[PDB]
Amino acid sequence: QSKSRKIAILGYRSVGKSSLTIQFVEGQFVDSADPTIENTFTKLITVNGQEYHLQLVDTAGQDEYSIFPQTYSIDINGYILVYSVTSIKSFEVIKVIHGKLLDMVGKVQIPIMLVGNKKDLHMERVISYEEGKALAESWNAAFLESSAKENQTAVDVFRRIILEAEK
Numbered sequence: 001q002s003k004s005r006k007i008a009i010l011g012y013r014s015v016g017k018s019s020l021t022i023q024f025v026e027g028q029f030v031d032s033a034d035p036t037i038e039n040t041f042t043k044l045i046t047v048n049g050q051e052y053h054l055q056l057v058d059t060a061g062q063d064e065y066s067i068f069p070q071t072y073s074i075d076i077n078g079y080i081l082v083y084s085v086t087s088i089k090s091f092e093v094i095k096v097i098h099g100k101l102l103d104m105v106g107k108v109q110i111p112i113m114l115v116g117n118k119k120d121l122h123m124e125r126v127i128s129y130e131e132g133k134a135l136a137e138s139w140n141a142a143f144l145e146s147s148a149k150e151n152q153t154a155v156d157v158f159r160r161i162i163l164e165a166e167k
């Protein structure tokens with residue numbers, strides 16, 4: 001009766017993959033997490049009356065030199081690509097990640113969204129909302145900005161990838 005979804009969170013180091021996931025899962029903002037270990041969390045959520053059992057795969061990051069498998073995992077239902085609005089490197093990297101991701105998954109109908117994180121650090125922003133939104137638009141992807149300090153923004157991220165999966 002409950003639907004099962006596996007979601008992978010990708011992105012450069014320090015963009016907030018872990019903090020976002022932990023905010024969503026446990027409702028806490030954390031100041032650090034093992035940068036080099038992949039963590040899998042589970043979380044039960046109800047979206048629009050529908051019960052979902054989530055496995056959230058919080059990858060250790062990737063950069064421009066990271067290897068992507070050459071073929072996809074049928075058991076992964078969506079990809080969240082995170083960058084930080086405070087890091088141009090992160091934003092450039094997320095484009096390379098998207099490229100290698102698309103090469104791995106090809107035409108498969110598995111949703112990919114883009115998330116500009118750390119929006120609370122408004123004095124440290126180097127990526128405009130427009131830049132992120134337009135990139136996502138050029139990918140035919142959903143876009144959101146988020147802050148791991150703000151529970152609703154993290155919830156909105158994971159809910160949106162779930163909604164995108166069933167379009």
Ligand SMILES: Nc1nc2c(ncn2[C@@H]2O[C@H](COP(=O)(O)OP(=O)(O)O)[C@@H](O)[C@H]2O)c(=O)[nH]1
Nearest residue numbers: 013014015016017018019030031033118147148
């Ligand atoms: N102010 C602020 N700090 C954040 C946010 N997300 C992550 N951080 C901080 O950024 C640092 C790296 O975050 P982390 O989740 O480990 O990034 P990861 O390497 O992508 O998993 C940590 O000190 C977090 O507390 C955010 O949305 N706002």
Ligand SMILES: [Mg+2]
Nearest residue numbers: 017018033035
């Ligand atoms: Mg992490």
